[PDB]
């Protein structure tokens, strides 16, 4: 129901630059197809060009100093029109270098495809938005939200369902207790032959290896306190 966009080179707007930035923060630099899937009407290579040429904060967009500018005239003299090598020598993007070289030596129609669109300035947007851009930001927030797998999401669901299942299981017992028939709570079943129930025994009980001092009366005081707590939970209910 969208007709297919076969050629996806366009003009970079503001929306796509900002979604590319908030996608590179989460997805990282070397996954480009997963970045460019987040914003339609652009390609994984054109996302890579828009990062490495324009949106990168390491890139040097300032005015040229006088030593920089004389260095540019000399390097453009020595290396004839090898602009990637020159731009590597200046730590500046190559499009900046070419346009500033044109400004030194000086002293698009409609219906054309612009090849240099990734290196050029963005277009700010009309005031409300377009509808497809509303859809783009909605699905982009939806894909930047999730940090879980299938197993973990199913675990969230299973914990909630077991919780509500226990609540219903206690509800019926409280109703039958009001009626006067005391159904004891059934236990979960063991999945294997030596699966351990944890109210029968202290399961790996380690005694504290007695010393020189005497602990009879403190034992009696603890035993009194615990017996009284269990009786109070039986009568009054915590």
């Amino acid at each position: 129901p969208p007709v297919p966009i076969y050629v996806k080179g366009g003009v970079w707007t503001n929306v796509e630059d900002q979604i590319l930035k908030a996608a590179v923060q989460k997805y990282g630099t070397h996954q480009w197809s997963k970045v460019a899937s987040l914003l339609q009407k652009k390609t994984a290579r054109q996302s890579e060009l828009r990062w490495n040429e324009y949106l990168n904060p390491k890139l040097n967009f300032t005015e040229f100093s006088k030593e920089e500018d004389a260095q540019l005239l000399d390097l453009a003299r020595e290396l004839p029109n090898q602009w990637r090598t020159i731009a590597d020598m200046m730590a500046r993007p190559a499009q900046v270098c070419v346009e500033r070289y044109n400004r030194l030596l000086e002293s698009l129609k409609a219906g054309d495809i612009n090849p240099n669109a990734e290196t050029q300035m963005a277009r700010p947007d009309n005031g409300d938005l377009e509808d497809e851009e509303k859809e783009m930001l909605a699905e982009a927030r939806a894909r930047l939200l999730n940090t879980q797998g299938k197993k973990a999401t199913r675990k969230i669901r299973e914990r909630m369902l077991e919780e509500s299942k226990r609540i219903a299981e206690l509800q019926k017992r409280r109703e039958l207790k009001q009626a006067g028939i005391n159904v004891a709570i059934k236990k979960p079943k063991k999945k294997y032959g030596t699966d351990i129930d944890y109210n029968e025994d202290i399961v790996y009980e380690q005694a504290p290896m007695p010393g020189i001092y005497d602990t009879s009366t403190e034992d009696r005081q603890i035993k009194k306190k615990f017996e009284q707590f269990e009786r109070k939970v039986n009568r009054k209910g915590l």
């Binding site: 030596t194 790996y204 380690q206 290896m209």
Partner: protein, 93 residues
Amino acid sequence: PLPTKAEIQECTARTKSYIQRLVNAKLANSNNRASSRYVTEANLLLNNSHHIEVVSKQMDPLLPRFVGKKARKVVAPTENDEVVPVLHMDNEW
């Protein structure tokens, strides 16, 4: 000092006897009939006095031997009262 030539012999003989008892038991519990050609070779008094005679029984070769034997998972209680001390002495990273 180095340990004397007699204690080396006493220790070697006692521990050799122990290792041979363990090896004979491990080769005698095996199901291989061929292992018992590699082994290298009672009365006890149950009270103040009773004089019993401990005999072994001759078992069926087809029925399983060591009928209590089975593969189980066991935890062991790690129990000590030897406290032993740990005898130590007194932004860049």
